[PDB]
Design an enzyme around this catalytic site. Sequence first.
Site, short mmCIF file in Angstrom:
data_model
loop_
_atom_site.label_atom_id
_atom_site.label_comp_id
_atom_site.label_asym_id
_atom_site.label_seq_id
_atom_site.Cartn_x
_atom_site.Cartn_y
_atom_site.Cartn_z
N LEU A 29 112.59 93.56 38.67
CA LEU A 29 113.80 93.62 37.87
C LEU A 29 114.84 92.65 38.42
O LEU A 29 114.73 92.13 39.53
CB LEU A 29 114.37 95.04 37.84
CG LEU A 29 115.22 95.49 39.03
CD1 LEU A 29 116.08 96.65 38.60
CD2 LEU A 29 114.37 95.88 40.22
N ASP A 30 115.86 92.40 37.61
CA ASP A 30 116.78 91.31 37.88
C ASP A 30 117.94 91.75 38.76
O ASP A 30 118.13 92.93 39.06
CB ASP A 30 117.31 90.74 36.56
CG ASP A 30 116.23 90.04 35.78
OD1 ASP A 30 115.28 89.54 36.42
OD2 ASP A 30 116.33 89.99 34.54
#
Lengths: 176, 157, 119, 128, 459, 87, 171, 68, 73, 65, 220, 110, 59
Positions: free
Chosen positions: F41-42
């Site tokens: 995930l970012d």
Amino acid sequence: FLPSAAYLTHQQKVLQLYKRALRHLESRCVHRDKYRYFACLLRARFDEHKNEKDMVKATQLLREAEKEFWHGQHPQPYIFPESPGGTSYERYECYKVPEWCLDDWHPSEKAMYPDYFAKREQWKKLRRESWEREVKQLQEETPVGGPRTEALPPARKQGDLPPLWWHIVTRPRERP
Amino acid sequence: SHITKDMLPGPYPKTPEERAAAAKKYNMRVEDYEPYPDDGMGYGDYPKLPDRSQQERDPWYDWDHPDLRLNWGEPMHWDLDMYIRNRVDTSPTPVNWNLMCKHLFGFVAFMLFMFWVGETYPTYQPVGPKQYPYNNLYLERGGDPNKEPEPVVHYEI
Amino acid sequence: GAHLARRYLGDASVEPEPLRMPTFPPDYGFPERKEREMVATQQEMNDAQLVLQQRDYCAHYLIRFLKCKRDSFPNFLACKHEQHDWDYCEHLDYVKRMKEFERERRLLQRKKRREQREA
Amino acid sequence: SFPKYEPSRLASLPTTLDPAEYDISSETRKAQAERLAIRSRLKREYQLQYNDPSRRGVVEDPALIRWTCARSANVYPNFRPNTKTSLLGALFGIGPLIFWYYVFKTDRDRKEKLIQEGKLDRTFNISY
Amino acid sequence: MLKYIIPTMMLMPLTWLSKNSMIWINTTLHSLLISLTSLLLLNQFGDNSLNFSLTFFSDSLSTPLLILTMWLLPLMLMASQHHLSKENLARKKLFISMLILLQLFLIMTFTATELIFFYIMFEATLVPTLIIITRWGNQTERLNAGLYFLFYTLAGSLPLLVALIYIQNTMGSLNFLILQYWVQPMPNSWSNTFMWLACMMAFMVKMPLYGLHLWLPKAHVEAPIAGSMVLAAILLKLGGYGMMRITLLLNPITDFMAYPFIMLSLWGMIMTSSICLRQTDLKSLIAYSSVSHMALVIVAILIQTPWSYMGATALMIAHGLTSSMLFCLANSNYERVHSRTMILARGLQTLLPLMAAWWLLASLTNLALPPSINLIGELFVVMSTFSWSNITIILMGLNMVITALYSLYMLITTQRGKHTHHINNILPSFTRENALMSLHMLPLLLLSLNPKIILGPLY
Amino acid sequence: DAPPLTLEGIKDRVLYVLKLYDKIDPEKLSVNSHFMKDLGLDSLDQVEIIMAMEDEFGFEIPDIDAEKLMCPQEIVDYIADKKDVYE
Amino acid sequence: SWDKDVYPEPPRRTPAPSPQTSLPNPITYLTKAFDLLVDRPVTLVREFIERQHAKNKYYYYHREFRRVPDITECHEKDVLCMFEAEMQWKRDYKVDQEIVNIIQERLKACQQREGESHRQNCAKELQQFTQVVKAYQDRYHDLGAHYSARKCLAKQKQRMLAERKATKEAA
Amino acid sequence: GKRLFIIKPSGFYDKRFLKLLRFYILLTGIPVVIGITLINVFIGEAELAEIPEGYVPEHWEYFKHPIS
Amino acid sequence: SKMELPDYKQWKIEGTPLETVQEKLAARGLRDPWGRNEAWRYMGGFANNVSFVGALLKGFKWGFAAFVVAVGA
Amino acid sequence: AHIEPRYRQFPQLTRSQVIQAEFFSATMWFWILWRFWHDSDAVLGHFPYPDPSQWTDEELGIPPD
Amino acid sequence: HAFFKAMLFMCSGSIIHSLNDEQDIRKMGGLFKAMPFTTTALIIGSLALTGMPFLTGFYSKDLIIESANTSYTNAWALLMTLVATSFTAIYSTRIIFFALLGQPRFPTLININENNPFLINSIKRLLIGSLFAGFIISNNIPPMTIPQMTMPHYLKMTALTVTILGFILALEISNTTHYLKFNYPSNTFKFSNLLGYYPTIMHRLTPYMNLTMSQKSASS
Amino acid sequence: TGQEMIISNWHWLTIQTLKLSLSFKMDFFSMMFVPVALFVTWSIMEFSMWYMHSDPNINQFFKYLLLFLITMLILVTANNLFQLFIGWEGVGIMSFLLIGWWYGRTDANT
Amino acid sequence: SIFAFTHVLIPVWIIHYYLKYHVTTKPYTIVEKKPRIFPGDTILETGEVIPPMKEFPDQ
């Protein structure tokens, strides 16, 4: 103004803006559901042009974002009651006594608490036993003609303690 | 102890060796050393700093001196006793400064003018004065035992 | 209310001034209507240490009020009918003051405007 | 959407809308590198002379000493009497004094003449 | 009175012919004995002063100041060790005998009758102060401090001699009684203006008034603690005592010629309370505080009300005790850290948790907390000057506000909020400093109970 | 006002609020994981996670650290620093 | 004790409360128990201390002085008349201030005892207060700090000469 | 297995000083107040009579309180 | 030191303002919230905490009984 | 030994605090009911406010003008 | 008023130290039935504010405002008391709504406890005080003034009128807070919220001026 | 009944035409306010028993709070106006100490 | 018992001893605003009535 490098970066600058705007949106918005709605709306507004290969238009949008943020902040941003600015700000600093004291006690009370002072004395011998050679050699050993950083290396050499650790370890416990 | 040449006579000139000396002395960037200048107000050769600097310096850096944002070696802005937090807090305000002063002066001016409008125009519920029993309730004000009767009466109406 | 609004907007002649309400000479439409009995026995009224702006009309209700309050002290809720009746007497005093007001008002209005709009 | 935040001598200019922070030339990178280097070396000297277990006294900062000696003892040298110094000296030193002097003459001559008439309220004014 | 003079002399060869670990007990014990001995004095009653000889006498202005002097010596003599116990035995003996000769001339000065004798004993009061502060001035400008000191005090106090000799050979002898009972009024020729100007200006210098207070701050920031306590309490209230006496003559022109000095004192009182709001060198704040209280004293002397003189003498004694105590506390803090600066030594509610009680108590007396004496003084002076004019209370109240704020700044600056945690050498409080605080603040509260003693001749 | 925190307890509470988060799985949810390598995930939702920890436990963490947590174990270590977790 | 002549009291006035209740009267119960449980032992102890002090007798005499003449019967400089003159005058000054104190304590007692009708039957005491304080204001007021005797007599002479010129002009 | 260890400055020197101060005032605070209590419970204050005819007093025999 | 962990996949959000705001944001076309966090704020002994005039009208439950009894007195 | 804390669930309530909470709310409400009805009429003024004085000219004393 | 707001502060500090000294209304929303002794305590106190007619708070406030209304007043102060009564109604009801009967937002690991003898003793004693003491004291005063009691119509109603419209106005603001729009600062918001401008202006202008003059003019 | 009385004793510095003793007066306000203030403070003593369970500096806290009560009482009772001024500055300075109870916290002593 | 015993007796005993003797020998001292008499009463001290008030009517 930070210990690691000379600047934040673009990335973390945008990031701190996002943290601040989300926090202010808490402080503006009660009832938590419309909060959740507007938080996803704000995330979408950053999702619109996340993927600019451009950079100069990105930082110009950063500046115009800061304008619409600072126009829209809150009078009381919701600061937590542990932070500076907040309600605490070393609230129980009444008892945050440094530990260079407690050795200047009369030996009646050094008889009142015996084992603690025995182990504290071997702590101070641990300190002085590895103070000179390892710590000062590791400090005058590694860096450049100027230090030019505010980190410091660990004591990966063999054994004992990383350098310059005494006032890091021996601090108040933040709730006495 | 303390060196004789770590005191500080005279301003800026001449710019090669003296600015090099003050950069070596006050521990600053070379072309950020600013004397005041020399209008002869005293002030020696001590730096100008960006002058607000104390609701600045965001408090998570964990420097040395916890309630002063010191770092043991900054050249320490001349008016520091006016800038310890608890003395003068120059925060970047949420609004302005001009907008603040214009709205505050406007509100208090308008309310004092409305007080004057009140002062010239009373209210009263429409009722004459009371009917004091013995000559506007005489003999029990300031004195006057046998000096003068002051005849004034009341009628049933 | 709006009687004061009339006094501020309209002609200020026929609306009287308070604190200078006594303007006309008396019994101009009365003649011989006055008692002002006041049987409240002013020496006794001073004997019990009464208050300035209470040395006034309807005083004897207050005398019996304080008398029964003192004399019935642990009966904490006792003196209420005398309290109510002293209230009624001061209500009549307030009514009589309002009657005095509009007496002098309507005299000034109707007399002055009648004479100076038929003369 | 906003009148761009005129500053003051009181309202600090915040970190965000400078707008000089976004014109990063190489000189600002150079200056921030050297400024971090200065802060690095000073914290190094301070921390080594802060964590000595034999160090009994205080660490004795030359910064505080230098500020104090600049503030008090290094005023009178140096100085020259300028137009600005002499002007502000005779203004903020003599102005209020001579003003307060004339107003107390005025109040005193009023009260002396007025009780010389005898029509003052000193019917009982014993605690003089 | 020679019953007080001669044991104060014989306390001096005592200190010579004692030895190591033997001078101290003798000096301190016997000086406390002399304090009881002059606590015996206070008999003074009714009609006039009381005459201790054909030569000495005591006004009731002189009794509390004299008792304050004999109280303040043993306190001082205990206070001035640990900064000279490691110096030599002969130099230490010379120090103690210097202070005893000092006290001897102070008693000589306060119990004067003739104003010429008063003048001789005035400058004999001067010369030990010089030698103490120069020999143990303990910083690099004790030179300039002593030099400024002696030239301001002499060159102001020099023509005072000429004026008094002129009065001597125009009006007979100079008993305070024969200064009284024979004084005739003197009109407004300009010679009278200069004669009044000479006498009043010499004591103005010694108060200080506002234009001549930079005499002071060098002479207290670069003094040892003994000479500082001496200088502040005894010498400034000695100058006030002198003007309080010799203002008996020359009342018919003091009205016409007193206007500039009052205005100088008022605007300088405001300016001095302002200038002690922002300085470093914590030792100097007490000095500028002292100039503020002495400016209020001078207002009280030049207005000539019995109300004013009662307020003046109470303000004298209370400020003497406050300033002497607070100098001793600042010396305690300088014994802790070798700084003298203000913003350095911080914290100390945690550490030494009862040193702060004495700081709090002295700071509230300097606030003029109301049962204390200093409020009695300031309040009666404000009453007398409001009867002087209906306008001056702006200045007095603004003095009260700025005095509150700098005194509270002294309290919560150095002893509030956070220890700098690179100190790690301060010792827990000795018994000695606790004893010194105890000797200051028992008599201040004990006079706060019963203050009818210390009011002046116009009681 | 002091219920004692402990290392197993803080581990459980942090992993409870990570598991409640939407776009991760309860399968590949490890203590020694990464918010950069394996959860993938970012950074944006990483700081949403940092916001979740600050808003649960009641205190800010500064942005000198929010750059550089990037794994749940160092999260637990850093509240162990702020709280000084022993009884 | 004191002289009730110089400290007068108004004649006493007390009624008796007559309930006309049936709770009744808790404070009467409390004041009887108060008298029996407080006022008895202190009465016995005061008896004991009175015997222990009246077993032998002291006296303190009210000091009294003579009347040495005046300042007006004293010569030019000649201190030995002026000295007695001024101490006689200054003792009159202190006793005169304390007379003013006694008038003021009468005035306070009249304020409290006459109650919220202020202007009833204090006005004779108010009258004598303004009389005596007109005298004090005229006589000892504006001499300032170093009042000795000579400024007092100067005020005397200058005042009555001003009044003599005023009545000469008024006639 | 619950309790912790506070870090105090000291108690010793402080409480020693205050204990000494109350002891060294109290050692003559007590017998003097006992003495004056015995004085005004035995010896008498004085009585308020006047000057006897042809008998000048001392400069004492003038005051209420016996210690004065 | 035990807590027993009242656990996940139990909240299952459904709490009517959060579910309907995920409806409105669904019609908006985002459909990516924070999620099932606040159901401990939206059910349990929670979930229609009473409206505001209910706390004011809370009084006469034991109240009117006592009032009618004192009316009968 | 005493009450526990729980996590993300509704806190337990012991019987005493809840029963005196309802008691104090009910006794306030009983008080204000009984006092609103026993004598006062603190909302009212107990004595009727009249008209302007009586509006009765040829009463209150005028001449017919 | 003394009984009244001592009870109010004591209830508030009870809530705050119940919830880990966090004290802020945002992050405090729904705490009704978190044991309702404190919720009952605060709704007693804050509806005794403005005087739910008629309790102890009724007598003082409402006889003051009607006696002011029956007085030779200054004609603007009457409207000031009007607007002030309305305002004290609306923030009273807003602080009850945001404090108690919202939806519970505050950080988890609840540690709420009031089974505590000293607190129920203290709060018990002060609601029992502030429910009766106004009536008991106002009943047996010696009558030190002449009560007016003769008011015109629509001038005795006005106390209850203004407090009721205050309740309704805060209620409708609350039911606008239930909505979602994310509105904007309208600067009257800012004048009310940021203390308007007086502590900021005076505490940043009066210290800086005297210490500019202490440095340049006075000292150096 | 009434019986509305003043006490006045121990005069010190009865200097000139004035005098001042410690004196205070029981009319109505200083008569029957004092029960309300004592009653409120009694409940706050309970509440601060509980609320300040966790400080060893509790005893000094009760000393300051009782000291503040004494000064508030001597303020509200007196009629000799100097004693009112005593009570004035004493309640001011006890407000100072108990606001600045928590040392540290630069906002608090500000 | 010992708390209420010593505190509401021993300072009460000492003040009640203080408030007879010394406080009455200082002459102008504690003084009472006068107990109000009402026209239907009689004097507690010696004993004589006050005339009652006159006619009421038209209540």
